[PDB]
């Protein structure tokens, strides 16, 4: 039902990232580009609870960036809302996630998405 | 199988006693 | 089947005095007979020369030389191991262990003792150094005795504190073939049976042990042949430095009966504390959680391998639990927790043996926390409950148990770090918008009182559900 | 039985006919201990014992009945 | 039970003689172990024989009581 419950079921029964993608499609008929539903926010919240991120939900977010499920703008905003900064491991994970899409950073959509990418940068 | 281990059950009782 | 043709050839024999005359003519003219005798010692009736015969059979069995001087007095004799039942020393002790075994019908434990007394003096030297080598062991033993007595001088602590956090340990001196045992640890579960009181008739196997000994190595080391503690700092021990000493081609050992799985950083820490290389050849490293599971599963063996795939189940009173122990989760270095099985730790002089033991105590404590997940109870795929948990190593001496919040839906991760043998600190890690579950000192209390993950997780769940 | 065979083996390791004929005489003693007086299987001994117990019970009960019963007043 | 006792007797006898004789002609662990089994089973049957002797003494006392009650009946 909620995105938190779907991600958490994906953590409970060990789902590989593509099986997570399929079952995430099946749980939600309207895709809504997954950014209306804030996939990046929920994945970052339930990945960055420990002192170190659990590699499962980070694998889910890295697949959801490398495959184009989630726009770069929602990821950059959800990265921006983290701070805390006392944990170096979560910060290094966020910088590897930024190392994925940065230098590429190419929106192919409406101009409002490009303005959103500007504000997100 | 499907049975609480006796040693574990005893440890559970001791833990419950601690902190009332 | 063969007995039928045997009885048929026996009927042919019915159709032996000539055989006895043939044996007599051969008398006028090896292994099999003594082998049949050693099988048939089981069937001998209790009598004094027959028990002498069975003790001679024990001597022939373990490779030792028997000599009777009467039907009372019989000597087991080899190059140093010389004792009677009625070299370079007296017959020291009328030890109640061997006499207690032999007064009953317990001859196999006598055989094990003669095996241990063989394995003490099977050192490779030309026999002269052997005596000196044994002397070095004696010096070591005396020093070790003093240290435990110094701890008993320091505080009048019970045997439990002597085991858990003291110098050396609960120290059983040698007696017959059983070498000197240090009990460095006993878990909160293994202390209890089915609530044991710990008075000084404590069992030899009631815990995790380590037997100290000497053993000939391929290298050469310098070992003391004198009691090295003549002067004692009144609350510590203090060692007068070397040379006396001689360069025996051997070293002292702490042999563990069951080999302990240790991490890589433990290997570097112990080779730093000792100075002597531990793994003479480099061994094949494996993830620690495989070795912890093989240790815990091979405690109580069954012919069916569990085929766990690192997903263990726990059947608990008011809860049902599942665990994913998660090897190959990467550390900050980029590698999994890799470790190997250690069985023999070599040290040169006895002042290292507390520090060494503190290291091993640390390591064994950590294994018990990951040992509590490894179970054989198969409540497979039960729809009710099955609170699905996960264990991951964030670092050496730290780990994390991650699990669903009992009220809300975000994850909650409890990080446990094992500072010392009986001290494990805990931190709850929680989303900023969640329910209060527990305080950290409660988690530390349940951990130090039980030393088991699932009991602490039930304590977390119950103290969450009361609120 | 068997320790005498052990002594014969020990004599063979030492070297005799004496203990062999003593084993034969021991088997003659075994015949004398097959004489006693029991031949049935122990199940048949149990059947006989139970039947004879029931016999003594019913005979004592009949004799007690006629102890107690007076046909006349 | 006498048949089983006597068969165990003669079997033990001449097969132990065979074991002795092959030792003598050498100067066979399987038939050794079977001799061990026969000896143990023979001793167990001798114990059962002493127990059945006790049973037969009880039976003799009991049938004397039988005859006495028969005489009272007659």
Q: Do C121 and C81 meet the contact criterion of CB atoms below 8 Å apart?
A: yes
Alpha helices in C256-333 (DSSP H): 264-274, 288-297
Residues ≥6 apart with Cβ < 8 Å to C2: E30, E31
Query: Which one of C5, C8, C9, C36 would you mutate to disrupt binding with E, by most E Cβ within 10 Å of its Cβ?
Result: C36
Interface check for E42 against chain C (CB to CB < 8 A): the answer is no
Residue C24 to residue D17, Cβ atoms within 8 A: yes
CA gyration radius for chain A? 14
Question: Which token pair is D8?
Answer: 């014969």
Interface check for D41 against chain E (CB to CB < 8 A): the answer is yes
Q: Which residues of D touch C20 (CB under 8 A)?
A: 16-17, 20
What residues of A are in the C interface, CB distance below 8 Å?
A: 2, 4-5, 8, 11-14, 45-46, 49-52, 54-55, 89
d(C-alpha C190, C-alpha E50), whole Å:
50
d(C-alpha C392, C-alpha C58), whole Å:
52
d(C-alpha B4, C-alpha C316), whole Å:
5
Residue C16 to residue D20, Cβ atoms within 8 A: yes
Nearest neighbour of C192 by CB, restricted to B5, B7, B19: B7
Interface check for C42 against chain D (CB to CB < 8 A): the answer is no
Interface check for C467 against chain B (CB to CB < 8 A): the answer is no
d(C-alpha C180, C-alpha C50), whole Å:
34
Q: Closest approach of chain E CAs to the CA of C16, in angstroms?
A: 7
Nearest neighbour of A50 by CB, restricted to C388, C400, C404: C400
Instruction: Give the DSSP per-residue string, chain D.
Output: -HHHHHHHHHHHHH---HHHHHHHHHHHHHHHTT-SS--S-HHHHHHHHHHHHHHHHHHHHHHHHHHH--S--
Nearest neighbour of B12 by CB, restricted to C375, C442, C455: C455
Question: Which token pair is A92?
Answer: 């290094």
d(C-alpha C440, C-alpha C425), whole Å:
8
Give me the residue label for tokens 């050498």: E26
Residue A49 to residue C392, Cβ atoms within 8 A: no
**Phi/psi at C130 (nearest 5 deg)?**
-55, -45
Name the neighbours of E, counting chains with at least 3 Cβ pairs within 8 A: C, D
Following CA atoms A106, A107, A108, A110 in sequence, which dihedral angle do they give, to the nearest 10 degrees? Answer: -150
DSSP letter for C320, please.
Answer: E
Nearest neighbour of C194 by CB, restricted to B1, B10, B19: B10
3-state secondary structure C11-64: HHHHCCHHHHHHHHHHHHCCHHHHHHHHHHHHHCCCCHHHHHHHHHHHHHHHCC
- Find residue C402's DSSP bridge partners: C390, C413
Question: Which token pair is E67?
Answer: 């005859």
Instruction: Give the DSSP per-residue string, chain A.
Output: --HHHHHHHHHHTT--HHHHHHHHHHH-S--GGGTTTTHHHHHHHTTSSSSS--HHHHHHHHHHHHSTTS-HHHHHHHHHT------HHHHHHHHHHHHHHTTT----S-HHHHHHHHHH-
Side-chain half-sphere of C201: how many Cα atoms within 13 Å? 0
Residue D8 to residue E20, Cβ atoms within 8 A: yes
Q: Closest approach of chain E CAs to the CA of D34, in angstroms?
A: 7
CA C449 to mean position of chain CA atoms: 23
How many CB atoms are closer than 10 A to CB C317? 12
Give me the residue label for tokens 């052997």: C130
Interface check for E31 against chain C (CB to CB < 8 A): the answer is yes
Question: Which token pair is D45?
Answer: 């001994």
Question: Which token pair is C149?
Answer: 């007595």
Residues ≥6 apart with Cβ < 8 Å to C276: C221, C251, C346, C347, C348
Interface check for C407 against chain A (CB to CB < 8 A): the answer is no
Residue C37 to residue D2, Cβ atoms within 8 A: no
Q: Which residues of C touch E23 (CB under 8 A)?
A: 32-33
Q: Do E13 and E42 meet the contact criterion of CB atoms below 8 Å apart?
A: no
d(C-alpha C409, C-alpha C324), whole Å:
19
Of the candidates C288, C325, C319, the one whose C-alpha atom is nearest the C-alpha of residue C306 is: C325
The Cα angle at residue C189 between residues C185 and C195, in degrees rounded to 5: 110
Residue C450 to residue B15, Cβ atoms within 8 A: yes
Residue C6 to residue E36, Cβ atoms within 8 A: no
Q: Which residues of D touch E43 (CB under 8 A)?
A: 1
DSSP letter for C430, please.
Answer: -
Residues ≥6 apart with Cβ < 8 Å to D52: E59, E62, E63, E66
Question: Which token pair is C444?
Answer: 């530390």
DSSP letter for C253, please.
Answer: E
Strands C320-324 and C387-395, bridge-based pairing: parallel
Q: Do C315 and B4 meet the contact criterion of CB atoms below 8 Å apart?
A: yes
CA D13 to mean position of chain CA atoms: 39
d(C-alpha C136, C-alpha C123), whole Å:
13
Alpha helices in C155-201 (DSSP H): 159-164, 188-191
Question: Which token pair is E7?
Answer: 């068969």
Sequence-ordered strand ranges (E) for C320-460: 320-324, 338-347, 387-395, 398-404, 411-418, 424-429
Q: Closest approach of chain C CAs to the CA of D35, in angstroms?
A: 23
Question: Which token pair is D55?
Answer: 């016999």
Residue C23 to residue D10, Cβ atoms within 8 A: no
- Find residue C388's DSSP bridge partners: C322
Question: Which token pair is E69?
Answer: 């009650």
Q: Which residues of C touch D1 (CB under 8 A)?
A: none
Residue C409 to residue A2, Cβ atoms within 8 A: yes
Q: Is B3 exposed, middle or buried (0-12, 13-18, 19+ CB in 10 A)?
A: exposed
Nearest neighbour of D9 by CB, restricted to C24, C33, C45: C33
Chain E residue closest to C23 (CA)?
A: E24
Q: Do C434 and C405 meet the contact criterion of CB atoms below 8 Å apart?
A: yes
Q: Which residues of D touch C21 (CB under 8 A)?
A: 17
Q: Is C319 exposed, middle or buried (0-12, 13-18, 19+ CB in 10 A)?
A: middle
Residue A46 to residue C392, Cβ atoms within 8 A: no
Side-chain half-sphere of C461: how many Cα atoms within 13 Å? 20
Question: Which token pair is C218?
Answer: 């391929």
d(C-alpha C253, C-alpha C331), whole Å:
32
Question: Which token pair is A78?
Answer: 């959800």
Round to the nearest angstrom and report the end-to-end CA distance of chain E. 37
Buried b / exposed e across A43-59, counting CB within 10 Å, b at 16+?
bbbbbbbbbbbbbbbbb
Residue D13 to residue C34, Cβ atoms within 8 A: yes
Q: Do E23 and E35 meet the contact criterion of CB atoms below 8 Å apart?
A: no
Following CA atoms C170, C174, C180, C182 in sequence, which dihedral angle do they give, to the nearest 10 degrees? Answer: -10
Interface check for E36 against chain C (CB to CB < 8 A): the answer is yes
d(C-alpha C287, C-alpha C304), whole Å:
23
Q: Do E17 and C13 meet the contact criterion of CB atoms below 8 Å apart?
A: yes
d(C-alpha D59, C-alpha D70), whole Å:
18
- Find residue C389's DSSP bridge partners: C323
H or E stretch at E69: helix E29-73
Of the candidates C293, C319, C316, the one whose C-alpha atom is nearest the C-alpha of residue C306 is: C293
d(C-alpha C365, C-alpha C184), whole Å:
11
Of the candidates C39, C40, C68, C64, the one whose C-alpha atom is nearest the C-alpha of residue C52 is: C68
Question: Crossing angle for the helix pair C440-450 and B6-17, nearest 10 degrees?
Answer: 140
Nearest neighbour of D52 by CB, restricted to E49, E53, E59: E59
Nearest neighbour of C20 by CB, restricted to D2, D13, D17: D17
Q: Closest approach of chain C CAs to the CA of E19, in angstroms?
A: 10
d(C-alpha E6, C-alpha E12), whole Å:
10
In angstroms, how far apart are the furthest CA atoms of chain E? 74
Residues ≥6 apart with Cβ < 8 Å to C374: C292, C293, C296, C297, C312, C325
SS3 C372: coil
Of the candidates C291, C296, C289, the one whose C-alpha atom is nearest the C-alpha of residue C324 is: C289
Residue C446 to residue B15, Cβ atoms within 8 A: yes
Interface check for C330 against chain A (CB to CB < 8 A): the answer is yes
Q: Which residues of D touch E16 (CB under 8 A)?
A: 5, 23
Regarding chains E and D, contact by 3 or more CB pairs under 8 A is answered as yes
- Find residue C85's DSSP bridge partners: C74
d(C-alpha C322, C-alpha C386), whole Å:
6
């Amino acid at each position: 039902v909620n995105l938190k419950q779907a991600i958490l079921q994906a953590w409970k029964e060990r789902w590989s990232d593509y099986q997570w993608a399929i079952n995430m499609k099946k749980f939600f008929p309207k895709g809504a580009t997954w950014d209306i539903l804030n996939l990046a926010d929920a994945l970052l919240e339930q990945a960055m609870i420990g002192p170190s991120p659990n590699p499962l939900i980070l694998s889910y977010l890295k697949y959801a960036i490398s495959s184009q499920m989630v726009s770069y703008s929602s990821v950059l905003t959800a990265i921006s809302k983290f701070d805390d900064f006392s944990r170096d491991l979560c910060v290094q994970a966020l910088l590897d996630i930024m190392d994925m899409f940065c230098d590429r950073l190419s929106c192919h959509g409406k101009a409002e998405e490009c303005i959103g990418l500007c504000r997100a940068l | 199988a499907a049975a609480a281990a006796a040693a574990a059950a005893a440890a559970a009782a001791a833990a419950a006693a601690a902190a009332a | 089947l063969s007995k039928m043709s045997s009885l048929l050839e026996r009927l042919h024999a019915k159709f032996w005095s000539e055989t006895i005359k043939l044996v007599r003519q051969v008398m006028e003219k090896q292994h099999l007979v003594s082998c049949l005798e050693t099988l048939q010692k089981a069937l001998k009736v209790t009598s004094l020369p027959a028990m002498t015969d069975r003790l001679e059979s024990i001597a022939r069995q373990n490779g030792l030389g028997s000599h009777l001087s009467a039907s009372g007095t019989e000597c087991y004799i080899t190059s140093d191991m010389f004792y009677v039942e009625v070299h370079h020393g007296e017959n020291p002790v009328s030890c109640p262990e061997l006499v207690q075994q032999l007064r009953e019908k317990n001859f196999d434990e006598f055989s094990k003792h003669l095996k241990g007394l063989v394995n003490l003096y099977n050192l490779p030297g030309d026999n002269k150094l052997k005596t000196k080598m044994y002397l070095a062991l004696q010096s070591l033993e005396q020093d070790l005795s003093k240290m435990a007595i110094m701890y008993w001088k320091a505080t009048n602590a019970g045997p439990l504190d002597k085991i858990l956090h003291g110098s050396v340990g609960y120290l059983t001196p040698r007696s017959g073939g059983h070498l000197m045992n240090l009990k460095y640890y006993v878990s909160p579960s293994d202390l209890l049976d089915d609530i044991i009181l710990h008075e000084n008739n404590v069992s030899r196997s009631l815990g995790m042990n380590a037997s100290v000994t000497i053993e000939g190595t391929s290298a050469v080391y310098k070992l003391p042949i004198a009691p090295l503690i003549m002067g004692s700092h009144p609350v510590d021990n203090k060692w007068t430095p070397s040379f006396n000493s001689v360069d025996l081609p051997a070293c002292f050992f702490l042999k563990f009966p069951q080999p302990i799985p240790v991490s890589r950083a433990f290997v570097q820490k112990l080779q730093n504390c000792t100075g002597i290389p531990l793994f003479e050849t480099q061994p094949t490293y494996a993830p620690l959680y495989e070795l912890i599971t093989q240790f815990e599963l091979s405690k109580d063996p069954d012919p069916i391998p569990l085929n766990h795939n690192m997903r263990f189940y726990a059947a608990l009173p008011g809860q049902q639990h599942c665990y994913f122990l998660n090897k190959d989760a990467p550390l900050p270095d980029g590698r999994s927790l890799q470790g190997t099985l250690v069985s023999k730790i070599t040290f040169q002089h006895p002042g290292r043996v507390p520090l060494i033991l503190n290291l091993i105590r640390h390591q064994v404590a950590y294994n018990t926390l990951i040992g509590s997940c490894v179970k054989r109870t198969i409540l497979k795929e039960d729809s009710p409950g099955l609170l699905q948990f996960e264990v991951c190593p964030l670092s050496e001496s730290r780990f994390s148990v991650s699990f669903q919040h009992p009220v809300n839906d975000s994850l909650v991760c409890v990080v446990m770090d094992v500072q010392d043998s009986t001290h494990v600190s805990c931190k709850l890690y929680k989303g900023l918008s969640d329910a209060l579950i527990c305080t950290d000192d409660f988690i530390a209390k349940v951990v130090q009182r039980c030393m088991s993950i699932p009991v602490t997780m039930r304590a977390i769940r119950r103290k969450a559900e009361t609120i | 039985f068997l320790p005498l065979v052990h002594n014969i083996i020990k004599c063979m390791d030492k070297d005799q006919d004496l203990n062999a004929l003593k084993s034969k005489f021991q088997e003659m003693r075994k015949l004398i201990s097959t004489m006693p007086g029991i031949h049935l299987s122990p199940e048949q001994q149990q059947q006989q014992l139970q039947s004879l117990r029931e016999q003594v019970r019913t005979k004592n009960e009949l004799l007690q009945k006629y102890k107690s019963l007076c046909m006349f007043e | 039970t006498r048949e089983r006792l006597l068969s165990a007797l003669e079997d033990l006898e001449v097969l132990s003689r065979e074991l002795i004789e092959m030792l003598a002609i050498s100067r066979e662990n399987q038939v050794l172990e079977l001799l061990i089994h026969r000896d143990g089973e023979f001793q167990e049957l001798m114990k059962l024989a002493l127990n059945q002797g006790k049973i037969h003494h009880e039976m003799q006392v009991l049938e004397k009581e039988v005859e006495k009650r028969d005489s009272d009946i007659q």
